[PDB]
Design a protein around this nucleic acid. Structure first.
Lengths: 232, 166
RNA sequence: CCCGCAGAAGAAGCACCGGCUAACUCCGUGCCAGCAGCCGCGGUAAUACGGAGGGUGCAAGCGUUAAUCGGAAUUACUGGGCGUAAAGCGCACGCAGGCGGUUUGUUAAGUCAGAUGUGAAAUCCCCGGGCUCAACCUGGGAACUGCAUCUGAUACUGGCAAGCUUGAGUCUCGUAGAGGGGGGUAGAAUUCCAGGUGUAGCGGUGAAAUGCGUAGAGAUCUGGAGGAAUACCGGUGGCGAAGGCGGCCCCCUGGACGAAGACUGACGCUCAGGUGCGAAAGCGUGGGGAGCAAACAGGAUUAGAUACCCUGGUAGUCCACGCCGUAAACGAUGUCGACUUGGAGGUUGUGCCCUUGAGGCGUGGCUUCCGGAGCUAACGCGUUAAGUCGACCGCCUGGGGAGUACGGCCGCAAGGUUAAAACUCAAAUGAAUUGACGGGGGCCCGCACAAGCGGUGGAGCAUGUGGUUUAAUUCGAUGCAACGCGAAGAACCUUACCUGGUCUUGACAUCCACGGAAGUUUUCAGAGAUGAGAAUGUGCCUUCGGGAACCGUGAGACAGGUGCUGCAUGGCUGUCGUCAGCUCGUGUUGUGAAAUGUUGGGUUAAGUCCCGCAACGAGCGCAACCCUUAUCCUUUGUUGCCAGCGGUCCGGCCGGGAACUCAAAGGAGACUGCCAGUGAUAAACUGGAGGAAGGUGGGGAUGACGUCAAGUCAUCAUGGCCCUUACGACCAGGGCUACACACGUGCUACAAUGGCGCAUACAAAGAGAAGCGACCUCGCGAGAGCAAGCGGACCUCAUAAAGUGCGUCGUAGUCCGGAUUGGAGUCUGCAACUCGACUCCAUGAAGUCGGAAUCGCUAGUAAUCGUGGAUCAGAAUGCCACGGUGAAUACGU
RNA sequence: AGGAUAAGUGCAUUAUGUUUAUGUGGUGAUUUGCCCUUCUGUAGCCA
């Protein structure tokens, strides 16, 4: 049960992450704790709808949240008050003037954590968990994704002893280091004690994420190819 | 990918379930093996042993194998026209002619196997190995020693079987 | 038994709830208590247990054992088994009894039909009937469970006479063989004696010692001694009744195998009882003894050593008969026979052949391989059955205990022979899959070895572990899977540990109540917590009710918990291993467990690729995208660079220049693609070459399903479940880092490839917003306080060192190493003593490359020297990454 | 002089492929074991 480190040692090497900001020096710690806080408190406020990825971003003089959903405009509310309130708390926690835009991910109507919600219910109510993980994978592969891995653990079925079980399908490489691929670890309790699902989902090996930049930044967009360079 | 036989009626008789171990070589995996019986209402030689990761995928595999390389077979009335003693691989079972006034008389999964077989009124004692995996061959070997009705006079009864091909 | 009258009154148990077998949650305890008709359980969140709610079933009954039938072809005539599970007699011969191929004559014991007499009654059975149905009792009919003889038949068996041949028996002829009984006969190893020649080991075995031997062994020539024994031919052959028979030959004689002439003509089959009869040793006497051997000794092995293995050494072995005949005493399969696709081996009568090689064909033979119809649970059987069967006899009814006891009998004499229970117990036992495993046979891989090189272990130090110690020196972890790791910077804090103060809404959130605003400056008491006083400020919101902020005070709800339990758990990860394989869907072969693929050969990082069987399709490991390097193209042109040119001490500092590195990035180039060798054609490895560079270019990323009850409840999540004046929390001090040593890891030395002295050289990379930092003044040096400056290609850490130049040094603790210790100077902070770090002055020890043990490494590696950084209040010998100088070899498993 | 089928140049350790001590008993993976059909019917169980 060796459990190779399933995503951490795979990032930033043409594999995007759930934060994109710049910091350095000794204040990186003050910006990261603040980024954890805004991740924790902001998704709790827009929890009215289900949510597929979370991206928080800090460029020059601003804080920009990207969020991805199964339907757009849904966390943005009606009127515009609902979204000015989302921008009130993003500024309050980060301490910079705030932006949010709404966007959707590739294959939006499917996501890692909504599979684990589906598997958890049967277990929460202490009935019908012997085909549930398999039906979850079947539905999941009918809504998208090129392969899925599910691993369930717990005092499963409400049992008075522990069980590991899993279910894998299609094409889910494990040494992969190119394209973002979506991961969730659930943790929850019910009457008998704790359950959990580790849900790896695999969209694409060059589909989704960033791509490698195809130029230097050095020749492009430069209307004057000198300052002096000795040529005047 | 094969021809299959069907019945216009459902049978999902799960008889056994097991697990596969290698214990050090890749250690032990979660796989199950399963045995499932598919009749017809009058009988089939349909018996299927298959295997997969989980119990549902395993049974459905085994239910598939119970209807390929198999054909249905048929017997008129809820009795058998021969008092014969069917043996298959140390699991030995008995039959004697009877009334319709008795239906089944049997227990466990055996009462469910005999109902589709048409040999439930004639149901007499089993001996030798009578655990689930082999007890259930009633509708296989007990329908290969088969007799079934086709005559109008008992004294034409052997004459009528000869002219069926002569 | 009925009518009328009160009235809701007068009233329900018993057994089940893990499964067998009609039902599940909580608490309790935690393999304990206690449960079990059987199966069995209990080891923490227990539907087995103890209690409760609830669910379930029967009901004035319920539940339950013993026993009978039946479940059970496990009560078997109908209807079981016997190759191996319990079970073919040890084998031949055969009376009594059971049984009789085929026809005629004949008889009618059994057979069957017909006839007649009998079989009372209902509780049972079938049809009525009656009592409040019913239970009960009962008429007619009946299973009436039991029985009779006459008449007739001859399809059938039995009796009997004569055949038949389709069964069997017998003569001469021929042939094979270790059958039986009794005779005859040769050569050579071990062993011995003798003489000749001749000198030291010989023997034994896994390796070994005990043994034998200089009194002359071992070996060798010549000649004698002696008894078992007799190869190779000899084979799966053949013979005997089965076990049984083995040098070769003959005499006496059996029993089988073939063929023609000839005969008899059911004379047949089986076998209770029965008599007869031995491989071997046991065993009486006779024969005989070279070698080997139980015993007995001694060696070797080891916890011993009776097993294992050897050496001496006796009865025994070795011969013959004889006494009860033991067993794996067998076509493993009773006896014998009839029938059922063959082919071929061994070896043989005989017809035919080129007699063409243990052959083929014709027709028999025993005897064995191979496989079809049919059979088994599997191996296996298959014309010699374990098929289809036949008659007739033997024998079995779970295991252990028992082939014993017990009984009958035989035996000098130990014994043999059929063959059992209480008691114990839920099994015992036939077969086979895959893992592991062979010490049976063989194949493969990782820097795991090798080919080397260096390192830990030894010194000392750094740092962790245990041992051991105190108030306590906190744990977690225990080869590979613990020990430079969780728990990277440990005075208190840290922080678990221990002791002392001090309080309980509590360091922290909200909610109510009271005193001080927090913030800042400032004196003081006490240890500090904490408090008093001074001086500055009374902000924040508002019903100025009152509260937030920090701090003290108090109460609940509630916060908090390195709280236990890692067989109660979640998240998470280490191992095998870069094993070279694993898995997902599905088919197929077997009754199936499960295999197959996923396994072989060749090849590989590779499920890569040639060949190929039930594997087919696809994913994982691996390959890839990826970032990086290498030249080289390519652009930017500073905080980077400078061929020519200026200011000029000749420094890109600056006028100026773009040839140039140069930084970060598009990338190009190299694909095992080519050629040649190797390789099974072949993947691919090696060589070959131009080039910056060739081995999937160099580097890194990079590791399957998953058992291991593996390790964390202590990041964190969390129930069952405990404290909540505390298993919380504020404050000080002490300790892990003690020291006895051992142990893991690493550091730097023991040299001279180095150190020293003087002189001399070039980096890469990165860190600095409470910080570091030029200049400054102070400083033995480290550093100090101030500060321009900084955002790090700008400024600073920084003199980078080893290395280089020359000279020098001889195994002497030195010309290496420099620990301790005296004593001074420094850092973060009231505060450096034990527990912290750095500078420097004088003296001066351990240590000569360290034993058992033991690992990493294939090239920017290994080795070795400095550097920076993560960590980081304060500081490094490590780690992490960089750059200096930069290696041996990779046959082989 | 038959030790002359000369090896039938058919031959290869030729038939036991063997031996130098061991280490207790049970223990992993689920409370819907559930996703193929009319009539003759089925897994707690149904058209």
């Amino acid at each position: 049960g060796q459990k190779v480190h399933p995503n951490g040692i795979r990032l930033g090497i043409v594999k995007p992450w759930n934060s994109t900001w710049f910091a350095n020096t000794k204040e990186f710690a003050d910006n990261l704790d603040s980024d954890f806080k805004v991740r924790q408190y902001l998704t709790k406020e827009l929890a009215k709808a289900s949510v597929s990825r979370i991206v928080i971003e800090r460029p020059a003089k601003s804080i920009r949240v990207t969020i991805h959903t199964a339907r757009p405009g849904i966390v943005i509310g009606k009127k515009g008050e609902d979204v000015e309130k989302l921008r009130k708390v993003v500024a309050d926690i980060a301490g910079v003037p705030a932006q949010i835009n709404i966007a959707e991910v590739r294959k939006p109507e499917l996501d890692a954590k909504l599979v684990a919600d589906s598997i958890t219910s049967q277990l929460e109510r202490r009935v019908m968990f012997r085909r549930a993980m398999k039906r979850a994978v079947q539905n999941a592969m009918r809504l998208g994704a090129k392969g899925i891995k599910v691993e369930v653990s717990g005092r499963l079925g409400g049992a008075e002893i522990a069980r590991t079980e899993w279910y894998r399908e299609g094409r889910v490489p494990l040494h992969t280091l190119r394209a973002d691929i979506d991961y969730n670890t659930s943790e929850a309790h019910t009457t008998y004690g704790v359950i959990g699902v580790k849900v790896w989902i695999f969209k694409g090996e060059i589909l989704g994420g960033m791509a490698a930049v195809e130029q230097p930044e050095k020749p492009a967009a430069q209307p004057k190819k000198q300052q002096r360079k000795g040529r005047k | 990918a094969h021809i299959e036989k069907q019945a216009g009626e459902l049978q999902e008789k799960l008889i056994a379930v097991n697990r596969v171990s290698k214990t050090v070589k890749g250690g032990r995996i979660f796989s199950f093996t399963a045995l499932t019986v598919v009749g017809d209402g009058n009988g089939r030689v349909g018996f299927g042993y298959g295997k997969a990761r989980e119990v549902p995928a395993a049974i459905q595999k085994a239910m598939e194998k119970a209807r390929r390389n198999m054909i249905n077979v048929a017997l008129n009335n809820g009795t058998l026209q021969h008092p014969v003693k069917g043996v298959h691989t140390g699991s030995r079972v008995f039959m004697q002619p009877a009334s319709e006034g008795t239906g089944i008389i049997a227990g466990g999964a055996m009462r469910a196997v005999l109902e589709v077989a048409g040999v439930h009124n004639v149901l007499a004692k089993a001996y030798g190995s009578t655990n689930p995996i082999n007890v259930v061959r009633a509708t296989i070997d007990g329908l290969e020693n088969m007799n079934s009705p086709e005559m109008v006079a008992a004294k034409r009864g052997k004459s009528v079987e000869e002219i069926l091909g002569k």
